[PDB]
Amino acid sequence: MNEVKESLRSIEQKYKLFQQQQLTFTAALEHCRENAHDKIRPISSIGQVQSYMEHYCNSSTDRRVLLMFLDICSELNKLCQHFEAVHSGTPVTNNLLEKCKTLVSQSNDLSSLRAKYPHDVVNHLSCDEARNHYGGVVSLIPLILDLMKEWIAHSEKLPR
Template sequence: MDDLERQLKRFQQRYKVFSQQQQTFTQALDRARTDAFQKTAVVRSINQILGWLDHAVHSATDRRILMLFVDMCRDLDRFRQQVEGHNMVREQLDRNQGLRNSLAKWRTLCNIHNDCANVRVTFPHGEVNHLSCDEARNYFGGVVSLIPVILDTINEVMEHLSSPRLSSTQKSNTSQRLSSRQHSGRPAPLGHPNGTVEERHTRFAPEVQQIPILEGKAPQQSQYHGTEVEDLLKDMQQMKWAASRKPWKP
């Protein structure tokens, strides 16, 4: 799991460098469309960019930035294959529907023939905001949103993988605390099924610990709307107050 998280951080660093060259990327796409006599063509897929690289891109700068995008998409798809082959992922695929959905979305986005024209990245990303309204709506909004959406999907996969591990860790910590309480003789927390009726009452009334309470029989309600132990405490307090008063003298 740790090695997968480290690889994800490396991809995030690579994309951070690429996103700083977004204007160069969109200008290269625009020149590639023009040279391919597709000036009004919408950038729809990775395969479309590969076709322009083979037949319409002649500038070394444009080829470099377009290859940077294609290589990163290819590496993200290879990373998906590595994640799907991980032992932890294979164990959870059958019982984790969210993990299966996230992996399927990841697989679809990395497909070179997938139509990404309608893909849009949302807040807190601002890639689409750096484009003009016409470009974002008609030409480059999908392709500039593709990699950040894939990275967000990978984060969802990592969350699905870490949530079962977190729950199992919490269960083990809880069992360890309960076993330590039993060995140390400390009472279980109030309301816990391991806490008996006698423990729950004597924790709030240590003065009457010597009063026995029958096992398996809950105290009955009285006129004070409390338990019998609470009534005894009230009676004892009244007796103590009466004994402390000085006798009345005429």
């Protein structure tokens, strides 16, 4: 479990960097939405975020932040395969693995997700902007980290 845990700690450092650059990420998301001129629907797809970064990215720092966020998502997707082969698990473990796959899925939505109690992303982002436009993209990382910690605790409590 330590081999996946090293990548988990690296992803924790990367998520800390993204939380520090949350304001820059929000500014980049607003600039991409203004360039795409489609503010009616909220951001819901990782594929939509990638398409926003490919064409509707304005600044070099914004492009770097979008690339860092996409690289964090790709590293999470790559570490999901290594976490899958750790243990066989129970039916609840399989359900949580399917939930992790759905959370890493680009086609699955993100607006219905919300930040956890330790996270302060809701306490940082704007009221209407996170309520209706881009709350889920900010909140997806901490819920995924909490689910990974819960899965690690479940595997630790589960006998091999």
